[PDB]
Ligand binder design. Structure first.
Ligand SMILES: C[N+](C)(C)CCOP(=O)([O-])OP(=O)(O)OC[C@H]1O[C@@H](n2ccc(N)nc2=O)[C@H](O)[C@@H]1O
Ligand SMILES: C[N+](C)(C)CCOP(=O)([O-])OP(=O)(O)OC[C@H]1O[C@@H](n2ccc(N)nc2=O)[C@H](O)[C@@H]1O
Lengths: 140, 141
């Protein structure tokens, strides 16, 4: 009854949305190991856009989060079944929103069809960027 | 054996500096209870300046940090002997820069004289605002 959970992400400018996500992942079953995958600077730039923080920084911050049991740094961009079998992963946690890879429309779709995906919910309006937006409007 | 450490703060827009301070506090001794105090919205505006996040949001964020054993929200601005009595605190953990208000040049002074203060180190250039400065200095994002 100990279920391995893999949640992957850039985890740039770690903020309460990520932390709450990691909490949902950890708490999907009574007993878990939560493995966090953090993407590389270079893949993140190729496929998404430039990263504010290096992989080292993004990895360091996540060590402070209560829910995290293990970290894979760097992690791959797309989840392969070789990868699930290597880290003994039972389910992959991430939001519902289809995640495009330029021509490939949802890199998580295979996992949903395979029965190996658990949806977590986004939290809105608490990003590191929304916080600065509040500062620039209390000025004004 | 078990030592009770009290770290107090605003803990606005929680960032790696804060987390590292808490980590240091927690690890001051082999066995500890880390109690974190989080200041009220109105006292923070009155004694320090704008607080971006409410008391509820600052409290919630700290819920997620590995080192935190207990939170006192809201906490008082100035530590008193009665407060250390109430929670059984051995040491208050904070950076060693004297912290002024209207009445005293260092609100930590009595604890420092009393052998009841543990200095933690600041970590510079990792704040939530410093991160947003790196986006803006290189708008290539
Ligand atoms: C690169 N991948 C495909 C391997 C995973 C990347 O995933 P991502 O770009 O959604 O990364 P991210 O760092 O933005 O999000 C990481 C995790 O944070 C969660 N998240 C993020 C922001 C937010 N406001 N609420 C959230 O719940 C996302 O749902 C995701 O589950
Ligand atoms: C208001 N008090 C007097 C009740 C508590 C102290 O309030 P404060 O203004 O220092 O709060 P703060 O939130 O700015 O910082 C709280 C704690 O994080 C530490 N800190 C802060 C910023 C930073 N870059 N590194 C840190 O180590 C501070 O030294 C302090 O120990």
């Amino acid at each position: 009854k100990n279920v391995v959970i893999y949640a992957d992400g850039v985890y740039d400018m770690l903020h309460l949305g990520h932390m709450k996500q990691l909490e949902q992942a950890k708490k999907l079953f009574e007993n878990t190991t939560l493995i966090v995958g953090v993407t590389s600077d270079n893949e993140t730039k190729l496929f998404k856009g430039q990263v504010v923080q290096t992989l080292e920084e993004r990895t360091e911050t996540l060590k402070h989060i209560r829910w995290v049991d293990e970290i894979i740094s760097p992690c791959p961009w797309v989840v392969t079944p070789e990868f699930l079998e290597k880290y003994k992963i039972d389910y992959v946690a991430h939001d519902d929103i289809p995640y495009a890879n330029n021509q490939k429309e949802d890199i998580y779709a295979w996992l949903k069809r395979a029965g190996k995906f658990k949806a977590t919910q986004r939290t809105e309006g608490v990003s590191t960027t929304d916080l600065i937006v509040r500062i620039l409007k209390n000025y004004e």
